[PDB]
Amino acid sequence: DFHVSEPYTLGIELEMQVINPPGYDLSQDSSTLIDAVKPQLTAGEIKHDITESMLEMATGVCRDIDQAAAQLSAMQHVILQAASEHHLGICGGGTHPFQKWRTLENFGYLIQQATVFGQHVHVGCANGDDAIYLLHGLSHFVPHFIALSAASPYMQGADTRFACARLNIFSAFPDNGPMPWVSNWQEFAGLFRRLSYTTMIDSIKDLHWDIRPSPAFGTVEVRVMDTPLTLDHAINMAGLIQATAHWLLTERPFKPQEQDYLLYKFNRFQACRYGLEGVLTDAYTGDRRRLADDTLRLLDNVTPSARKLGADSAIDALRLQVKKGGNEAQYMREFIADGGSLIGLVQKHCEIWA
Amino acid sequence: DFHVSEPYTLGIELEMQVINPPGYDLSQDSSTLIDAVKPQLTAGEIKHDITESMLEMATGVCRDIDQAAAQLSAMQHVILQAASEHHLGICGGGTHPFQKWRTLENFGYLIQQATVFGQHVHVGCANGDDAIYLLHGLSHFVPHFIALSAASPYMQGADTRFACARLNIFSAFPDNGPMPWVSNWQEFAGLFRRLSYTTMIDSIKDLHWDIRPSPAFGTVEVRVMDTPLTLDHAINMAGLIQATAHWLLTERPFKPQEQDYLLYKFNRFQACRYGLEGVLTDAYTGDRRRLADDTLRLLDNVTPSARKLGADSAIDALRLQVKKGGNEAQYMREFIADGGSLIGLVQKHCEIWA
Numbered sequence: 034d035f036h037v038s039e040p041y042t043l044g045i046e047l048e049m050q051v052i053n054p055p056g057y058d059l060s061q062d063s064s065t066l067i068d069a070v071k072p073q074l075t076a077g078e079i080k081h082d083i084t085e086s087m088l089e090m091a092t093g094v095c096r097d098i099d100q101a102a103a104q105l106s107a108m109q110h111v112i113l114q115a116a117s118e119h120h121l122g123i124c125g126g127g128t129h130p131f132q133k134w135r136t137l138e139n140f141g142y143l144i145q146q147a148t149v150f151g152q153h154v155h156v157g158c159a160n161g162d163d164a165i166y167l168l169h170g171l172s173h174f175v176p177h178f179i180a181l182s183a184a185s186p187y188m189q190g191a192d193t194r195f196a197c198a199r200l201n202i203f204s205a206f207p208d209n210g211p212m213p214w215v216s217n218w219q220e221f222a223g224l225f226r227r228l229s230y231t232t233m234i235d236s237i238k239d240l241h242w243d244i245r246p247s248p249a250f251g252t253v254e255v256r257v258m259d260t261p262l263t264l265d266h267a268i269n270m271a272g273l274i275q276a277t278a279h280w281l282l283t284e285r286p287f288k289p290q291e292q293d294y295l296l297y298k299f300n301r302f303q304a305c306r307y308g309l310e311g312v313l314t315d316a317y318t319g320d321r322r323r324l325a326d327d328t329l330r331l332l333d334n335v336t337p338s339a340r341k342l343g344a345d346s347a348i349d350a351l352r353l354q355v356k357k358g359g360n361e362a363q364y365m366r367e368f369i370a371d372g373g374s375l376i377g378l379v380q381k382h383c384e385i386w387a
Numbered sequence: 388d389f390h391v392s393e394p395y396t397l398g399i400e401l402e403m404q405v406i407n408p409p410g411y412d413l414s415q416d417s418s419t420l421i422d423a424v425k426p427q428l429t430a431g432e433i434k435h436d437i438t439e440s441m442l443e444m445a446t447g448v449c450r451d452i453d454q455a456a457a458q459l460s461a462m463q464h465v466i467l468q469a470a471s472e473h474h475l476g477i478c479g480g481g482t483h484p485f486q487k488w489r490t491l492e493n494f495g496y497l498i499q500q501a502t503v504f505g506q507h508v509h510v511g512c513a514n515g516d517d518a519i520y521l522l523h524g525l526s527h528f529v530p531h532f533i534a535l536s537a538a539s540p541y542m543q544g545a546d547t548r549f550a551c552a553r554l555n556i557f558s559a560f561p562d563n564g565p566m567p568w569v570s571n572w573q574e575f576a577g578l579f580r581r582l583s584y585t586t587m588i589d590s591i592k593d594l595h596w597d598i599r600p601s602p603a604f605g606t607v608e609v610r611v612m613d614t615p616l617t618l619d620h621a622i623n624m625a626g627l628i629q630a631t632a633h634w635l636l637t638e639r640p641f642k643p644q645e646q647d648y649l650l651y652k653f654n655r656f657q658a659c660r661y662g663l664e665g666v667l668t669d670a671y672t673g674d675r676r677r678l679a680d681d682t683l684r685l686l687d688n689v690t691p692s693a694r695k696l697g698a699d700s701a702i703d704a705l706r707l708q709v710k711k712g713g714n715e716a717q718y719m720r721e722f723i724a725d726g727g728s729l730i731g732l733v734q735k736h737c738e739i740w741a
């Protein structure tokens with residue numbers, strides 16, 4: 034079932050907040066911005082989501098982060114243009130810091146909390162058995178990815194004490210968290226066949242896993258990241274995932290087993306609550322490594338791969354971020370301790386995107 | 388180790404709501420009520436929890452639903468008198484229809500939520516391999532237990548659209564849901580040794596699974612039901628659960644396997660969202676049976692077990708419930724569609740408890 038990709042190919046989706054410049058709440062009509070924009074587009078796709086306070090931008094299939102980065106700018110330039118003209122703003126962030134409130138029948142008040150904004154990264158694979166191996170490998174660094182990209186400390190007017198609270202709002206859905214264990218593509222096809230016997234699942238797109246394979250695009254999509262405040266930070270996470278994927282498939286450093294996932298949810302929570310401060314627990318021995326120490330280990334491990342792919346810039350910047358500093362949620366909170374308001378925080382994010 | 392128990396013994400825990408009679412919000416001062424009641428007990432305990440809007444009442448080790456009924460009647464006569472003379476009222480339901488509000492370091496805004504009320508039922512086992520087997524059998528019927536006992540359609544003044552919304556507020560904890568697979572008691576001690584390598588867990592009380600073996604008490608505890616509106620419905624559920632444990636251990640319907648749990652979370656969502664109207668899906672054949680229909684199968688199957696244990700009155704009352712309508716949450720909505728107010732709802736609920 035698996036479309037064949039040039040291995041290590043890259044694709045980025047970004048879910049973008051649309052703002053309203055007086056009071057800076059979430060906009061009501063982004064289908065007027067999106068319809069203004071499409072005409073003037075050269076590279077990429079801009080898509081309509083459901084609540085009309087979101088603007089998805091996506092690259093095409095990219096051969097490295099330079100191509101990705103410049104497709105992102107070609108969309109940004111056009112977006113920021115038509116935004117001025119409709120007196121609107123655009124920013125990232127995993128949540129909007131203060132906005133309050135047929136898929137409605139199925140899920141009720143679960144889809145009536147914060148509307149929520151993520152970055153997805155696609156990586157190309159040769160055959161699909163590789164895709165499953167890669168998925169398992171990338172699942173070991175889901176905490177790392179989350180903590181490098183956390184950008185959602187504020188929900189519904191208040192500090193949640195989480196670096197990433199965005200992911201919490203998906204947790205009562207039956208399909209949340211890690212993909213159930215399969216060992217190869219034959220078994221994955223078996224899993225999807227059985228899951229789809231339910232009323233709730235008709236397609237691959239209906240399964241909101243942390244990491245899921247796309248048969249159609251020939252990829253593995255990692256979906257845990259909050260939409261970041263800036264294009265550089267998005268590109269840096271894309272490079273890390275590309276580079277990590279290359280390390281895994283090339284050097285094959287793991288022999289993945291079902292018992293690896295045992296503490297998946299405990300480690301994933303640690304990265305959401307705290308950040309790079311979160312504590313990782315090994316399933317088998319119980320040895321615990323601080324998240325920050327362990328992402329330095331990861332950035333070291335994937336440096337050779339990043340050089341071959343043209344993504345050394347990205348893991349150079351991430352190493353800076355970890356060694357002295359933190360995620361974009363940490364810095365949102367320093368802004369507030371300087372007597373800033375939440376109305377002014379969102380405004381500074383609209384500007385920072387540029 | 389697994390304390391040896393007389394097979395099919397019964398424990399009932401009931402978390403009750405303590406109410407403030409003018410405006411019918413939850414009271415904050417329910418431990419002065421408890422301390423008036425403790426001395427006058429001839430059988431069973433009463434406790435406080437972290438907020439003092441809850442009153443835990445637990446039977447001791449009982450031998451049938453008649454012994455359980457008797458102690459719960461005896462505790463209740465004494466609490467109805469201690470609350471009457473003390474300006475407070477008592478009711479059930481898994482959620483308060485409109486209440487708003489050290490460990491808030493660990494979980495933040497997640498425990499700063501609606502405080503929720505549940506009924507737990509322990510069933511005793513001889514060896515601790517029978518517990519693992521019993522747990523896997525009851526897991527098949529979690530959807531049914533929830534659908535039958537659902538009593539939490541309103542949160543924060545609004546209709547969630549769910550039968551049981553109480554179970555959603557736990558979904559963000561990494562340990563929510565089903566216990567990860569083990570095939571026997573030796574494997575279960577391995578599982579627990581590994582889960583406890585984390586900061587977040589030291590004892591068994593810390594793991595908030597739907598069904599959970601208690602080695603100390605020598606039981607399997609099912610933990611998914613909302614506190615019902617009356618003691619009779621509480622007892623009928625205990626009766627069904629004990630009859631079901633007997634049928635399972637005695638006739639061994641199932642050869643349990645990890646792949647049996649594939650659709651577990653999809654099926655329990657259906658029970659939470661819809662009533663007995665939820666549809667249950669078989670992991671192997673993809674067969675869809677409506678939940679009201681499958682609860683009648685479960686009722687017929689455990690009829691011989693229930694008769695033997697003196698709980699045949701409970702499965703007679705539940706067959707009635709399944710045939711002529713549905714759960715307490717449904718009848719909560721009918722009171723509001725009739726012209727009722729949410730304050731009147733809680734007041735009616737204090738009256739039904741007597």
Ligand SMILES: [Mg+2]
Binds near residue numbers: 046153254
């Ligand atoms: Mg995507």
Ligand SMILES: [Mg+2]
Binds near residue numbers: 507608610
């Ligand atoms: Mg309990």
